[PDB]
A paper describes a structure:
The enzyme [name] from the lankacidin polyketide biosynthetic pathway of the bacterium [name] represents an interesting test case for understanding such gain-of-function, as it exhibits a monoamine oxidase (MAO) protein fold yet also carries out a macrocyclization reaction. The catalytic mechanism proposed for [name] involves initial oxidation of the amide function of LC-KA05 to an iminium ion. This is followed by attack of a C-2 enolate anion on the iminium to give the 17-membered lankacidinol A (2)8—an enzymatic intramolecular Mannich reaction.
The structure of [name] co-crystallized in the presence of the analogs was then solved at 2.80 Å by molecular replacement (the statistics for data collection, refinement, and validation of both structures are presented in Supplementary Table 3). Analysis of the crystal structures with substrate analogs bound revealed clear electron density attributable to EMAA and DATD, but only one of these compounds was present in any given active site, as their positions overlapped. Inspection of the two binding sites coupled with mechanistic considerations identified E64, H65, Y168, Y182, R326, and T397 as candidate catalytic residues. The presence of amino acids in the active site capable of acting as general acids/bases contrasts with other flavin-dependent amine oxidase homologs which lack such residues. We have shown here that [name] is capable of binding two substantially smaller substrate analogs, and shows tolerance toward structural variation at C-6/C-7 in the native substrate.
Numbering used by the authors:
A (entry chain B): 3 to 133, 139 to 438
B (entry chain A): 1 to 133, 138 to 438
Write the structure that this text describes.
Amino acid sequence: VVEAKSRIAVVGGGGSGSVAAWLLARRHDVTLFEADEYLGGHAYSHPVETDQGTLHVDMGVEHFNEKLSPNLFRLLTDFGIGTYVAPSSVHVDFPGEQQSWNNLDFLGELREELHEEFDRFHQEMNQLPTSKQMSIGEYLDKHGYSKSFKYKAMNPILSIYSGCHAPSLDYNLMYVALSFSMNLLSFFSAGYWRKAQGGIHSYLARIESDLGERVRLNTPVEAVVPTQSGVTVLAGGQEHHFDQVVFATHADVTLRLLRTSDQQYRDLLGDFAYVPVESVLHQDESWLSPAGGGAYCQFRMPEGFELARAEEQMGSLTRNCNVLHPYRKVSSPILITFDPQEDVDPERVIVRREWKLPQLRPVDVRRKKRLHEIQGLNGLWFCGTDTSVTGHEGAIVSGMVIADRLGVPHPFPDDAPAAAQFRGIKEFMGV
Amino acid sequence: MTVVEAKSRIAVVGGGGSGSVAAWLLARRHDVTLFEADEYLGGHAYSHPVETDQGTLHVDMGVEHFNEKLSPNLFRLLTDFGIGTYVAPSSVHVDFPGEQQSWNNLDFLGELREELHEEFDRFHQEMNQLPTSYKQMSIGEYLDKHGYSKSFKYKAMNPILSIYSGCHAPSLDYNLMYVALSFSMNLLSFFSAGYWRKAQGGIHSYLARIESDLGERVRLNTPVEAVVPTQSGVTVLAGGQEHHFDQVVFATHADVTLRLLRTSDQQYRDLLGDFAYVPVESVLHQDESWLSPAGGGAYCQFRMPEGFELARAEEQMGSLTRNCNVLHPYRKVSSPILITFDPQEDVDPERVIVRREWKLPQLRPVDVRRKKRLHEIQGLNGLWFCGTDTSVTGHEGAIVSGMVIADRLGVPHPFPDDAPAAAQFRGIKEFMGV
Ligand SMILES: Cc1cc2nc3c(=O)[nH]c(=O)nc-3n(C[C@H](O)[C@H](O)[C@H](O)COP(=O)(O)OP(=O)(O)OC[C@H]3O[C@@H](n4cnc5c(N)ncnc54)[C@H](O)[C@@H]3O)c2cc1C
Ligand SMILES: Cc1cc2nc3c(=O)[nH]c(=O)nc-3n(C[C@H](O)[C@H](O)[C@H](O)COP(=O)(O)OP(=O)(O)OC[C@H]3O[C@@H](n4cnc5c(N)ncnc54)[C@H](O)[C@@H]3O)c2cc1C
Ligand SMILES: CCCNC(=O)[C@H](O)[C@@H](O)C(=O)NCCC
Ligand SMILES: CCOC(=O)[C@H](C)C(C)=O
Ligand SMILES: [Ca+2]
Ligand SMILES: [Ca+2]
Ligand SMILES: [Ca+2]
Ligand SMILES: [Ca+2]
Ligand SMILES: [Ca+2]
């Protein structure tokens, strides 16, 4: 039971928090706390100086579609932010001579070896959504796919979203099925993908401007204490009082900040699974695949791979930003290596970033759904990646869902797919 | 409305995909005779044997594309016949007269790509956003109203639509939703090869099986000359003989249907008259000169000859080539296997394997409206109509229309378990008016 013009705090300045604060700001007194020096979190664009001018390179969140991300798209559109097609072309390289396969054509020894399996996979995945809670790994095993397919094709292609470190093979089937079914990932063609003009940051910079002074950068919240009068927030050596609090931070962070003598919170937010990611923005051209170049996503496997004990060895994924259409005139290399197994030359490094991605096993999905129990109690609310469906659309729409619960309705009722997303995420979240 | 019973003497006129599938389903419950003018079953679905060093191959000269999502009934049918399928992605390369005046969906090379990239980009967005939100408008009209360049219309849109309308087609007059959905469903794209499948050993493989199942009932080289309903039934005149049937199913083009049909009713002329067609000449050849120098690797190769003249674009040429060597099962074949549709340039005759001449229906909003209207004459004088001109575009629509008729005559939809195949069936049934 929330009255208008309440004092509301939003903890976490990532996509979900920023969009939640921004929508909440219309009807309530809103304050947004953010630990780091910018808004976005995983949505980060780093300025790179080049012969064409200053480019803002997306190191984390970078992909969406008008179909997959309707709310994010309408938002970018309403902000006069242009988008552009950056197709998901993939090149996978293995230690043996010509042990490769790619999205664009049929070249490589690995392509020869696995072609029939790639072919059956697409069919099976397209036929699957029709006529559930099973891992991709389980599926591949029961449907007689080779171990070589699992580790030389499936695991590398899934690394683009999941990160090379991820136990991707343990992720729910529908997530993989739909990534194929909706041409996001393919073995035969580059996936239909878009990026935002001047980086993903552009939409967040606008939100920051709209919120102005309500945004508290470099203000990590240390504790959240509900009381009888209202919730108390401790941040930057000050105590702030609020009617309600919205957590837009990771479940592990939420729990660390959250201070209550209730152990339901420990049950619900305890041991959410995460995957660490190290994003390396660099100019070391040695990372490009000799046979690779032209492909956007370049996966490389180090020398001592060994198919038996495939799990111990890990791969490295590189984004070749030069391939991006707006970066076509740039003379200097712009590369992003995630979790580089081999050392990246330090003289060529621009910046490093360290994040953690949530795991997507059917158990993790079940864990996420269960939060509706604590939704709205002690004047607390939870949005973000850990409370919603995977991807940026899911993160920001969870923020939207909470704003609707606090009076500010879904801002795009006209956009039928955006309303469809909203309704879907609302059903998924306990709200 | 109508009463039909078991073991009726039923004739199916036209041995194309629609007719063959209709006869095949009908044969279960009725005495069925299938009349086919040509020496084989399939019509547009034709696979020609080519002898190569690696093996003897059946090359699809028409009707080579489908996929499991778009064509559920055709797919389940191929599957039930133990016919394998394989991914043949729709890679496209377009060539124009000027130096490096090209664009392709595999990469960003070419001067045409540089000139048109931003338009390709906006088009995909606009097309993806359209279905979710009028219906009766041509692609050309849409492109004009949404400020797309004339260069986009004739150097990009018209060539890419040439893939399955044919180079001669007034493709720009075709309905918007057909183009919107071709893009929306990754069948056609400017950024990636479309997701398409081909049938193992040619498209003919499924028809050869149907022909075997039908056996004797199939009367090849038996063009029907006239169809005469009477008070007792319907009389069919074919191959200098008169056959009597309880009901007749037309699985042929409306212009053919009308020519054969003879009644003292002018509703039939109103309904089947004015069906618009586009001629296609499919040339199976080995002349390697037809491949684009910059092109090769792309499956579909479009070439615009010298003296194009953008202002006089509407009356302009266009030649589309399929480079079959690019197909995965044809990878070890040493000899070239090319198909040029409507070649403007003189093709070397010593390199020609065979030619085929067909006519494709037009897809303007008016033509679509014309197709739906055929529900008026459906079931009258013991007559039934199925095929391309009575249904949605593509092979799935054609065969499914035959199935819809079969259900009307007792034989229900053979794949109720396959939810998408049943969904198609239901959709086509509503479209057809039965
Ligand atoms: C490398 C990488 C690539 C990705 N690529 C894509 C992609 O292409 N497409 C896509 O759809 N998704 C992608 N994602 C998914 C991504 O996780 C989400 O899209 C989105 O960023 C989630 O937003 P969020 O706010 O819920 O989490 P986050 O973006 O991580 O937001 C959490 C925020 O909380 C802040 N915070 C932490 N501690 C405190 C504290 N004590 N007090 C206050 N604030 C605090 C953090 O500083 C951060 O700003 C990617 C993620 C990563 C890591
Ligand atoms: C070059 C070409 C390429 C195509 N490619 C594709 C593709 O990739 N994918 C796709 O989905 N569709 C494709 N199509 C669409 C195609 O038209 C339909 O898929 C399919 O032909 C529908 O079959 P139909 O039986 O209704 O027509 P048709 O296949 O043309 O069948 C008509 C039949 O009637 C016969 N007939 C004619 N006169 C008589 C008579 N007097 N008596 C008896 N029988 C007669 C003809 O000989 C023929 O066999 C293509 C068509 C062409 C021409
Ligand atoms: C939304 C309609 C999608 N249908 C198609 O693209 C057709 O099946 C296409 O493959 C085709 O062959 N159309 C008829 C012209 C040959
Ligand atoms: C099916 C949704 O897939 C996604 O959006 C993934 C998880 C990304 C782009 O991180
Ligand atoms: Ca990643
Ligand atoms: Ca460079
Ligand atoms: Ca590329
Ligand atoms: Ca130039
Ligand atoms: Ca698409």
